[PDB]
């Protein structure tokens, strides 16, 4: 490990030699500590148009070394015992099988510089020097060394991210975890489709639907998980394999991290730590690898439930042919009984033995959130109540009687995130264009929420019609950004929910917003609506005044549209 992280530690120790020191009283328990050195937000438009939520802490409650240290000590400075050898044998077998299924109709490839550039443009990438540094680190990797692939507690230098993209980006670009290729994956599906996936699963004969969340998934990715994820390199030709093995072994299996920590009299230090497991969040293929390993975990849980695996198999896997047979016979059926998106999963097992199939799950360190370790899981009878990707999904009916299945979540989080501006010296223009992005996203996905349809229409009425939406409104890969457009949102709504919606049999267009339904009031309120409560009523009654205010701020000379009418 030390020989692997060596030149990175040296490269930092020398960039910072005059302030470099070793803190004997550092707080790191499960990370290797190597030394330290000395170290150095509201969207106004949305806020002006969402006054009732100024006093809603669920909304308003949404950098400092003092915080990073706290979250590090409680979340990341932890360790889990190794799984037993039999458990590890099962993990390796299932991983090998799954990789071979995923690669049956797809071949790994190197992703290109121009792919990365084009993906970025949707100008460090248009400096030759950047690519000189990149080529440089690359030849280091090809020689068997790493100088500069270091995490900031988990952001990374754009060059390192390009090398990762080059070696493993194919998993994303060629949709290895798409539902067609993986059975249980959902990569490429939007929030406008996931609900249909859950409904489909609800129809499969079997037990309840289970959606257990793992407590701190990324922190419970083991070195064995990483080794099993690395098995994809066996499907690569040798050069590609060299690049990928470099990325995995020097960046995944042996990571170096810089993290901030408070010092004396307002001063700040940077600590350099390292370890050999856990997932570095926010890497290029973090999502794909999380999806992979979660699929493996659920397959194993099903095998325990169905009594293919027994207690004795934890210590040492006796006859492994039973595992191979179960995978070849039932593997794909079980995969199609899953919806897995990174660390999130829903499973429809063949019966409810799944609920108490916990031995391998717990031995793998994948302990369930908010539950006693050996308390059986509780599943759902009603697919519309199942949590998945921070949402639940409801069937609603258009005025003409056709049904749609829509994404829903507690409203406070949506409004709270829309109020956040990532910039600083952000003009009214960038602020307004971001507000417009949120509004149009709500029009596409959360139109069925009264407060959000109203607020979105006010925002869209307060921003010049020709201003193009900018910024990002979600980190979920299932928010596909169809709303990032100046195209009319009813047209976009039709394309998303009718035209290109395979679960919409009748392709008759919807020609007005009033034909598009809300949740029932009970449901709207349950999920955080303020309909009926006085500040919200006042807000709605005054909304045109407020819109005119924002218009006067941005400029009365601009062209505005009335989406409130
Ligand atoms: Zn490197
Ligand atoms: Zn809801």
From TrEMBL:
Residues binding Zn(2+) 2: 392, 408, 527
What is its quaternary makeup?
Homodimer. Interacts with host SERTAD3; this interaction promotes capsid protein C degradation. Interacts with host CAPRIN1; this interaction is probably linked to the inhibition of stress granules formation by the virus. Interacts with host G3BP1; this interaction is probably linked to the inhibition of stress granules formation by the virus.
Annotated RdRp catalytic domain ranges read 207-357
Compartment(s): Host cytoplasm, Host perinuclear region; Host endoplasmic reticulum membrane; Host nucleus; Secreted
**Organism per entry:** Zika virus
What protein name applies here?
A: Genome polyprotein
Q: Which superkingdom heads the taxonomic lineage of this protein's source?
A: Viruses
> Its function?
Binds to host cell surface receptors and mediates fusion between viral and cellular membranes. Efficient virus attachment to cell is, at least in part, mediated by host HAVCR1 in a cell-type specific manner. In addition, host NCAM1 can also be used as entry receptor. Interaction with host HSPA5 plays an important role in the early stages of infection as well. Envelope protein is synthesized in the endoplasmic reticulum and forms a heterodimer with protein prM.
Detail which positions bind Zn(2+) 1. 137, 141, 146, 149
């Amino acid at each position: 490990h030390m020989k692997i992280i060596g030149n990175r530690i040296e490269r930092i120790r020398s960039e910072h030699a005059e302030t470099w020191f070793f803190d004997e009283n550092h707080p790191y328990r499960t990370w290797a500590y190597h030394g330290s050195y000395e170290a150095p937000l509201i969207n106004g438009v949305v806020r002006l148009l969402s006054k009732p939520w100024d006093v809603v802490t669920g909304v308003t409650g949404i950098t400092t070394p003092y915080g990073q240290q706290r979250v590090f000590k409680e979340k990341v400075d932890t360790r889990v015992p190794d799984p037993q050898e039999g458990t590890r044998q099962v993990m390796s077998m299932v991983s090998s099988w799954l990789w071979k299924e995923l690669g049956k109709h797809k071949r790994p490839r190197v992703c290109t510089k121009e792919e990365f550039i084009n993906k970025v443009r949707s100008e460090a990438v248009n400096d030759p020097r950047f690519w000189a540094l990149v080529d440089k680190e690359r030849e280091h990797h090809l020689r068997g060394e790493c100088q500069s692939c270091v995490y900031n507690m988990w952001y990374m230098w754009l060059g390192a991210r390009f090398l990762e993209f080059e070696a493993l980006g194919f998993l994303n670009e060629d949709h290895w975890m798409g539902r067609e290729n993986s059975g249980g994956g959902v990569e490429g599906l939007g929030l406008q489709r996931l609900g249909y996936v859950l409904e489909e699963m609800s129809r499969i004969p079997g037990g309840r639907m289970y959606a257990d969340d793992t407590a701190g998934w990324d922190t419970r990715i083991s070195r064995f998980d990483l080794e099993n994820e690395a098995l994809i390199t066996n499907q690569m030709e040798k050069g590609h394999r060299a690049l990928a093995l470099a990325i995995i072994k020097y960046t995944y299996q042996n990571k170096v991290v810089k993290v901030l920590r408070p010092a004396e009299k307002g001063k700040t230090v940077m600590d350099i730590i390292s370890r050999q497991d856990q997932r570095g969040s926010g890497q290029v293929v973090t999502y794909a690898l999380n999806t992979f390993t979660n699929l493996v975990v659920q397959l194993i849980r099903n095998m325990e439930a169905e009594e293919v695996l027994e207690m004795q198999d934890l210590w040492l896997l006796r006859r492994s042919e039973k595992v191979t047979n179960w995978l070849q016979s039932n593997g794909w059926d079980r995969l199609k009984r899953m919806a897995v998106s990174g660390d999130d999963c829903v499973v429809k097992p063949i019966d409810d033995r799944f609920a108490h199939a916990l031995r391998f799950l717990n031995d793998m360190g994948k302990v369930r959130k908010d539950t006693q370790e050996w308390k059986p899981s509780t599943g759902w009878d009603n697919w519309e109540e199942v949590p998945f990707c921070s949402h639940h999904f409801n069937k609603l009916h258009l005025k003409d009687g056709r049904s749609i299945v829509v994404p829903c979540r507690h409203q406070d989080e949506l409004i709270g995130r829309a109020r956040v501006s990532p910039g600083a010296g952000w003009s009214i223009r960038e602020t307004a264009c971001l507000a417009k992005s949120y509004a149009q996203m709500w029009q596409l996905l959360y139109f069925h929420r009264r407060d959000l349809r109203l607020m979105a229409n006010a925002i869209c009425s307060s921003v010049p019609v020709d201003w193009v939406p900018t910024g990002r409104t979600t980190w979920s890969i299932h928010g596909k950004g169809e709303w990032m457009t100046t195209e009319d949102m009813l047209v976009v709504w039709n394309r998303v929910w009718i035209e290109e919606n395979d679960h919409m049999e009748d392709k008759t267009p919807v020609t007005k917003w009033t034909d598009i339904p809300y949740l029932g009031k009970r449901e709207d309120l349950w999920c955080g609506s303020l309909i009926g409560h006085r500040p919200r009523t006042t807000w709605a009654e005054n909304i045109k005044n407020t819109v005119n205010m924002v218009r006067r701020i941005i400029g009365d000379e601009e062209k505005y549209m009335d989406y409130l009418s």
